[model samples]
Target chain A: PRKLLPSLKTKKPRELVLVIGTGISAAVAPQVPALKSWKGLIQALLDAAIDFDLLEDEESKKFQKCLHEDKNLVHVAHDLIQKLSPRTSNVRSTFFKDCLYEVFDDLESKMEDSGKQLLQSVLHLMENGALVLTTNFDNLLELYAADQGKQLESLDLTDEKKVLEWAQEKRKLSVLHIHGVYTNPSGIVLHPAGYQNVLRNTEVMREIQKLYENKSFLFLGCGWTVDDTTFQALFLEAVKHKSDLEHFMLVRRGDVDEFKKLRENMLDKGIKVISYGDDYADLPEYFKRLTCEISTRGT
Target chain B: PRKLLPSLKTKKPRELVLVIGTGISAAVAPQVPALKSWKGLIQALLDAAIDFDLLEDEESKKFQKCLHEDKNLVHVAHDLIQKLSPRTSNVRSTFFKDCLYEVFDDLESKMEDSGKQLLQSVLHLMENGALVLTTNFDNLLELYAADQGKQLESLDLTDEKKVLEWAQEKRKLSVLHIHGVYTNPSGIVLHPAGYQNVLRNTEVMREIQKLYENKSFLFLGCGWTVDDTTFQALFLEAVKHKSDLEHFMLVRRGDVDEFKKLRENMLDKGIKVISYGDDYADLPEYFKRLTCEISTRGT
Candidate 1:
């Protein structure tokens, strides 16, 4: 209700879109404890199996070799610790999902009340429209939108025909997920091999290319790490091919080095980003500030 | 010219272009005289000169302090490595630039004998033209072109009058250097503070925006580090502003992780990229192979 920033008044309201990533959920999830450390977890597993002594010397040697090579085994061991450790249930996958849903839902409810009201104001101001594009497997946004009685579309790319249709029909107000949902983890694009093949799909590629062609994106809750291959591809393609896009990223403020690289990488591709805030929690506030600025600028 | 791969004949030219980062270049560069590894180079420098030690300590210590107070340091460091490391000129920098130039130059020359002719044939067949955009400071491409009796227009940002003039008069054939030149190390953007200010400059920004708006670029011998800020800003702005242009990148095969991130970042803003090559060396060959394929397909 009260104006927070004057600059937001004059600025023309472009699309006000929010892209949610896994980081948000990860942040909300309870800590799992299977092992005190990864090394400890592996050692514990080996210790537990020592009583059986069923393994021959060669098999023991083979197990050592497998430990070195099998990332899945390492992941499973870690997961096992988390599942079995103290406070494990609180941090379990399902619990984490619930936490994310609760937080996001609460945030959605408060959109018209708290500082988040700024986002609502910006959304209301957008002449064209607003949408949320998320790679997160969570249905947090959908739940929030539903409670608010907002019209929304969920694009799950696992269904090839549906994805193809969505690719053909470009909608103004929609949340397009290039990867499938998290409810069915298998639905999401997971392995590197699957990701490589995803690139070759004309329908999916076209959808992604379309997004890059049309949106002035603000990347939130996305980590610029090797594990996030989809985001990596999108980032490069957006910067490389579509030279005309205003881009911004909401990363923690102190990461000057990473922010600089992100800035450079984005800038090289013709994207402009203004980063602020000390932590991920501060991101929403910073975005609120930005939206307020935009609102005051009078777009 | 003989075709190298049959599939190369049918491969479509990519519209999105990428510039790989120093990670790949350094990975390939010869080891520094004093340091057995890049990590060792930094460690050794920190031990040798007090000035280097002070700078490193200050930066690192300040970074650690900032991390607790402000988590943004992670992002900052990530971005800084890509931007500052390439310009260090110290052991790491020297190895990076020299190795990249040597490899790129050799690749270009080899392609000249086997690849360029194929490219020329492809160019003749396609009514569509080609545009070269590179972040590299080296004059390898220019030298290669000169050897063939072709002149290259080095579109340097510092030469405002020439850049503006070029912007006004769109040429059929041209090479634009977003980051300046290599021979004169100072010519390239080396400082973050300088880079930040340069992007916000009206004249430089305008010129870059105009070029991006007008041209579909092919990024060659480009690295995805922090020095690429100018190009990144230009590309992001173009996409954000919805300018009518496209670009493509050539990268090594296994380095698709980096490439994917670059692409995704841009795609979120509406850009597309097509990749070619299995390794760094394969990049030029991929281009050459594409040229041959286009030529044969046309016939």
Candidate 2:
């Protein structure tokens, strides 16, 4: 309704960064049993933590209390790291890695027919050369990239220097994971500590800042509580500096009051919020339509 | 100039939180040579790190390069903590405390006549009842409180539970130090780890968010680069949620381009940035006028 789709037509494919989140995977493969929200993911990690003997079942309840009482997932994640102790550094690394592996396993084959069409739409956009960034640990995009016989580079938060180079090179056919992929369990950023790492890397933040000034960002499958420091930095940057480019976020909210309230708030931060209605299934369909419209009209 | 003074007249003193920054201390007592910005503060800490044998002179240049090139002070502070290793945690804490002690020493007696007058204006506001929050580690406010024969409670980042209670109790005569006070060396928050601590504390963030929604904030001696997680969270909260009360920030900028630019940006985040001209001395004068005008016109 805000012409968010029309705005994409005027911009070159290279002038966009498609920010994907957890919701996309869930929408694409409902039967996969993948953790959809950050809360679910953290709760899974908590259960795993107890299984690994990193945290006792009784102490696990404390984290559950914090999670339910405050609704702060990042705080709970960081506490998990703290209780593991610095002495158990390697053990802690393996702990998260194993947990991530358990949750995101076999995501590629899990997609149904509609999910494949949705993924193909995403691939079509990427093939046409839009920069891709995801906070998901799942390799759905990678699997799609492989099936399409297209090589794509994956960059994580630890690859700050390479990300800067990639940004400078202005190359497409790449995906930047602000969170660590499942392959590198040590790098996943469920905690504020991982976010702090991204913040510490000046090169990474500067490149993201540059992207914000020059490119349009299309946020997919993201909710309000983006535990991502890059997005948080961009929000902070938008408030601190003037920018002409307006970003778009597609939100699927069932509640009318919450949806209306979120729309106004996102506008203040220079983001245009488009509602895809309440149905989870409608999200992929919306994206499929958006991709087709943008690609066709853009040509 | 934009009726900021007049706007304050409509709100009760308790509805405002006085957010004091390091700029305020530097303006009031120039002779103390306290670091005025995050960059300067981190650089001093680097020097101290080398003095304590926590970092080598050769490696220190690397940090200096990062500081000069990126202008990311928080990253530098966090890097210092990382290099110190988890084993040297005690030493790291002492290093920061020692550096802070060196800079802010004897600030109470260092205040000039104009400085005293400036601080008195702040005290006047506090006396009339305004919740004060500062990112500064200095005890200038404590000294002022003592001189005025008033008992004011000092709360730091570690006092998250107390802060929640204080917020719930609706207490006004208290200063919550988002950064730790110099007196409690271990509690100061110059690094991202400290900020992560703030982020981990859900109760504290909730209280700050409550203040953002309920109370108006008058930022004194602050700049655009707010390293404190509380303010970052507040900005994020504002973008994610709706708020009616507008916060005010007093910025001192010499360049017209930067000043005009910052003003527009801050407005989007629901903060009204007011200029007190280019002169440092005018900051205090502006404060005095603001406090007097607010008090008189408010009644």
What's chain A's TM-score in each predicted model?
0.57, 0.82
Stretches of model 1 off by over 4 angstroms after superposition: A1-18, A26-128, A160-169, A178-186, A196-198, A203-207, A225-227, A234-246, A268-271, A292-299, B1-299
DockQ of each: 0.01, 0.01
lDDT, candidate 2, residue B274?
75
lDDT of 2 at A289: 69
**Tens digit per residue, CA lDDT, model 1, A187-263:** 44444444556555655666656655564455555444222555666445434553444344555546557755765
**Residue B267, candidate 2: alpha-carbon lDDT:** 66
Residue-wise C-alpha lDDT for candidate 2, range A1-299, written one tens digit per residue: 11222235445665666777766677666544335555656666677777888878778888777656545555555566567644244455466566667776766666655566677788888877777777776767777767767777788766766566666746677887766586565555556556666567656556666676677777775556343544675346534443343466667646655655665565445454555567666666666766777777567
Candidate 2, B201-220: lDDT as tens digits: 66666776777777777777
Per-residue lDDT of model 1, residues B1-299, tens digit only: 22244332333432212233332232233234211112333333333322211123455554344334422222433433343233422211121233223223333322324334433432332324333444444343454457555456566555666555544445434555644454433334544443564554456457556556554444333334422454555556544555334544443334668767767654443345555433344544554555545445665
Q: How does model 2 score on DockQ?
A: 0.01
Instruction: Return the top candidate by lDDT.
Output: 2
Native contacts matched by each model: 0.00, 0.00
